Amino acid sequence: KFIVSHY
Amino acid sequence: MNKVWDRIVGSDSADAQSVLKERCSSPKDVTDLLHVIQNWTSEIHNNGEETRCWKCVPMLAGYVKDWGQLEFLCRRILLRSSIQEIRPLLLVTMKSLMSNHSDNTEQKCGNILQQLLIEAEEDSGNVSLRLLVDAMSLVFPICLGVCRDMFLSTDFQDILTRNLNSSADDEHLVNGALRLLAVSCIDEAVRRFIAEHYLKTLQQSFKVEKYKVLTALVLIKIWSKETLNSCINLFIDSLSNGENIEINTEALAYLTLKPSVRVLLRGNGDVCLKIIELIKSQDTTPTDLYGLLIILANVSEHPSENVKDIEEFNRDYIIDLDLIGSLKSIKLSTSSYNQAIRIIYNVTRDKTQISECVKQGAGLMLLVFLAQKRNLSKDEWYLLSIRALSKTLIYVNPETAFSKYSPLSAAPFLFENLPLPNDNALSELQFTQLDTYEALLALTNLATINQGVDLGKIILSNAQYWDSIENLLLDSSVRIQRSTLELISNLMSNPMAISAKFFCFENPKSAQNFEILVKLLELHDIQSQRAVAAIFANIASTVPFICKELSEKRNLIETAIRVFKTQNTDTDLRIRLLVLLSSIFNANAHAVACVKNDEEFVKELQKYRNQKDPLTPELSKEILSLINLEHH
């Protein structure tokens, strides 16, 4: 559901 | 014997070390063989036979201890110093006579050099003088005493300088002498004389094209700025032409340690095209390739010269000309591989070029380098590779970074840049706090693949990986603590990996973790708070069993509501708390009855039933209707 991504 | 010798020099089909068996009897070999060599070497043979002779002589020479049995070799070697093809073999043979007889071998050499000088003086031609300087430049670094004494004698200086004045048109004499000057610079006393008596000669010889490279070499070693700049400009210019590759490459590799040389090199577009072409060329020597890679890595390095100029070079000459992509199909030794990794690292310091690096295969090159060194050398190069890998896995989609190969094979190396349980700790890799931060950013991206299942499987296969993550939950660094919580929130998209670490309330260690996590909801770092809230929201909205237990945890509910009352203006945090609270309130009507008379909670929910935020009005309505359920 909640996802952290840096790309 | 004598036939053994003919076999050793007859053809390349023979192994001299193997013939040792034929050289069984110590004397026969220690004598006849030496005598056969004395008689054989009294003439000059073809370079094939000479090569084999001076490839085998060192072996027997090293074993013999009687000097009177190897004394003849000094004249034989020094009289062949003008045969360029066997000069390195002659040096090894003389170095073999250094382990033993060191004192007697230097004294024999001086007596020969002194005899050679008298022959040069009496020779109307130039060949005797060339032989003397060639003997001196060959044996200088191992016979400094007698060679310094000869070079500094007035009788030697006199014949040398005079023949450089009268026979400037003799390139073999001049270039032989320029090599002597450069080799002899290994001695400080000699360097001072050259820097005090040869500057004029070197200024004249710098004007002749075929003397320029060796003159600039001597001028570099005699430097105690246009004197240096004209020398370097010759190295760059000569290298862009493609000639004297070994000398200019070795010279420019040491010279590119200075910023002013790098700027000059970076500004010469002609040599930069040539350096990339030579690296890509399948004809250049491995020794030249290494130097070419050293120069490029030195010139591509970001400082801690202007950054935008270095960034412009890396884009225009390394990335534009596909330097990285060609390194995949080139044979690299360990030291050249080290520079290739260094070049990749340098380019990735500009994040705009990382995507091009990955397309050219830089990811696979980092991975293979790391796997090859894993059980071998976790040295500074090993660390540098992980640094480049971290930065790569931060800015590109992981699934496209390793030629369709799983990006999760990178995980183990990233974990190496994370502090291990203090009980163990002590890691060869001297990773800094920034390295840990960057590895955690990269792992968080790896955790986005398949709801974190794939990275979770790696964490589950080694309890040391989870311990390292848990050890950073309360790190003193805000950015490390934030990135650790973000990593965990992605890993909570599937309960297999680490859900038991926080939500196994029958385990005291896990239950204490949960209490700590609850308290972290009120961290001062909003990014951290969003991630903590995401941790809870993710499993609560996905695992009904865990959701049921969470709905009975008074401290979690009171803390979430408290944070919601005071920070609901932050969209991401608000949405995450609403998902968590609606999940909890849908599972536990008695939790709803606790808050049904919270006036401030209700009014804050009512204001949001009115950006790209559709979940906020919907979840606010759902929660308010559940509170209405508890009233009607």
Numbering used by the authors:
A (entry chain B): 74 to 80
B (entry chain A): 1 to 224, 230 to 309, 335 to 640, 644 to 665
List sentences from the manuscript.
The UNC-45 chaperone controls myosin function mediating the folding, assembly, and degradation of the muscle protein. UNC-45, which is present in all eukaryotes, employs a UCS domain to interact with myosin, a central domain that mediates oligomerization, and a TPR domain that interacts with members of the protein quality control (PQC) network. In addition to functioning as a folding factor of the myosin motor, UNC-45 can form linear protein chains that provide regular spaced docking sites for HSP70 and HSP90. Structural analysis of a minimal chaperone:substrate complex reveals that UNC-45 binds to a conserved FX3HY motif in the myosin motor domain.
Given the difficulties in obtaining a co-crystal structure with C. elegans UNC-45, we moved to the less complex fungal orthologue SHE4. Despite lacking the TPR-domain, SHE4 contains a functional UCS-domain for myosin binding. Isothermal titration calorimetry (ITC) measurements showed that 13 residues (561–573) comprise the core of the myosin motif, binding to SHE4KL with a KD of 0.6 μM. After intense co-crystallization trials with various myosin peptides, we obtained a well-diffracting SHE4 co-crystal with a peptide comprising Myo4 residues 561–581. We determined the co-crystal structure at a resolution of 2.4 Å and were able to visualize a minimal SHE4:Myo4 complex in atomic detail. In this structure, the Myo4 residues Lys561-Phe562-Ile563-Val564-Ser565-His566-Tyr567 were well-defined by electron density. The eight myosin residues are accommodated in the UCS-canyon by a dense network of hydrogen bonds and hydrophobic interactions. The tight binding mode forces the Myo4 peptide to adopt a bent conformation, with its C-terminal portion being directed out of the central groove of the UCS-domain. ITC-measurements showed that binding to the myosin peptide was abrogated in the N475A mutant, confirming its participation in substrate binding. Taken together, our structural and biochemical data indicate that the conserved myosin residues Phe577, His581 and Tyr582 mediate binding to C. elegans UNC-45. We propose that the conserved FX3HY motif represents a universal and highly specific substrate epitope, recognized by the myosin-specific chaperone UNC-45.
